[PDB]
Each structure stands twice: as structure tokens, then as C-alpha cells.
Amino acid sequence: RMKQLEDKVEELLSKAYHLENEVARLKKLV
Amino acid sequence: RMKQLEDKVEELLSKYYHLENEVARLKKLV
Amino acid sequence: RMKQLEDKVEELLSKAYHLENEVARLKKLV
Ligand code: NA
Ligand code: NA
Ligand code: NA
Ligand code: NA
Ligand code: NA
Ligand code: NA
Ligand code: NA
């Protein structure tokens, strides 16, 4: 149950921090 | 347990919407 | 609350993926 969705939320957290940076890239160059 | 998960998924739910706006805005700006 | 949680991160993982795609698209327009 919960160790499965925690590692998903972990994955989610990583992704969010990833995309956040990407958007910063785009915005500073666009 | 389930407290911290719903906690973080709201962080994530809002992060993800926030990004969707940045992407929408950025699409207009290219 | 457990099942709603697991399905909520479902949407998140899937929106995470389309943001990667839409931010990848915007990369070579800027
Ligand atoms: Na996996
Ligand atoms: Na509550
Ligand atoms: Na936090
Ligand atoms: Na969207
Ligand atoms: Na996924
Ligand atoms: Na992935
Ligand atoms: Na790049």
C-alpha cells in the first residue's frame, strides 16, 4: 500500500523539481 | 501516514497546475 | 482515503508526463 505510493510521490517530487527548472530555462530565454 | 501523502499531493497538485500556467503562458510567448 | 490517494497520484504522473512533452516541444521554439 503506502510504500508503493510514497515512492510514487517521491518520483512525482523529483519530476516537479525537474519541470520547474525546465520552465525557468524556457522563461529566461523565451 | 495518509496525512503526509495528501499533504504532499496537494503541494504536487498545485505545483503541477502552476506549471501548466507557465507552459500556457510560454506557448503564447514564442 | 487510500484508493482516492493512489488514483490522485495517477492523474499527477500523467500530467507530469504531458508537461514533459509540452516543455520538450517549447524547447526548440525557444
Ligand atoms: Na516505476
Ligand atoms: Na483532511
Ligand atoms: Na513542502
Ligand atoms: Na494542460
Ligand atoms: Na509515469
Ligand atoms: Na519518466
Ligand atoms: Na535545452
UniProtKB/Swiss-Prot annotation, chains A, B, C:
Induction: Translation is induced by amino acid or purine starvation, or during growth in low or poor carbon sources. Translational repression during nutrient-rich conditions is dependent on four uORFs (upstream open reading frames) present in the 5'-UTR of the mRNA; these promote ribosome dissociation. Translational induction occurs in conditions reducing translation machinery efficiency, leading to ribosomes scanning over the uORFs, and increased translation of the mRNA. The rapid translational induction is followed by transcriptional induction at later time-points, independently of the uORF sequences. Phosphorylated by the cyclin-CDK PCL5-PHO85. Residues 5-26 are annotated as: Leucine-zipper. Disruption phenotype: Abolishes recruitment of the mediator complex to the upstream activating sequence (UAS) of amino-acid starvation responsive genes. Decreases RNA level of genes involved in amino acid biosynthesis and cofactor biosynthesis during amino acid starvation or methyl methanesulfonate stress. Growth dependent on amino acid supplementation. Sensitive to amino acid starvation. Sensitive to purine starvation. Decreases cellular glycogen levels during glucose starvation. It is found in: Nucleus. Master transcriptional regulator that mediates the response to amino acid starvation. Binds variations of the DNA sequence 5'-ATGA[CG]TCAT-3' in canonical nucleosome-depleted 5'-positioned promoters, and also within coding sequences and 3' non-coding regions. During nutrient starvation (low or poor amino acid, carbon or purine sources), it activates genes required for amino acid biosynthesis and transport, autophagy, cofactor biosynthesis and transport, mitochondrial transport, and additional downstream transcription factors. Residues 89 to 100 and 106 to 125 define the N-terminal activation domain (NTAD) and the central acidic activation domain (CAAD) respectively, which can function independently to promote high-level transcription of the target genes. Homodimer. Each subunit binds overlapping and non-identical half-sites that flank the central CG base-pair in the pseudo-palindromic motif 5'-ATGA[CG]TCAT-3'. Interacts with the mediator tail; the interaction with GAL11/MED15 is direct. Interacts with the SAGA histone acetyltransferase complex. Interacts with the SWI/SNF chromatin remodeling complex. Belongs to the bZIP family. GCN4 subfamily. This is General control transcription factor GCN4. The chain holds residues 249 to 278 of 281 of the full protein.
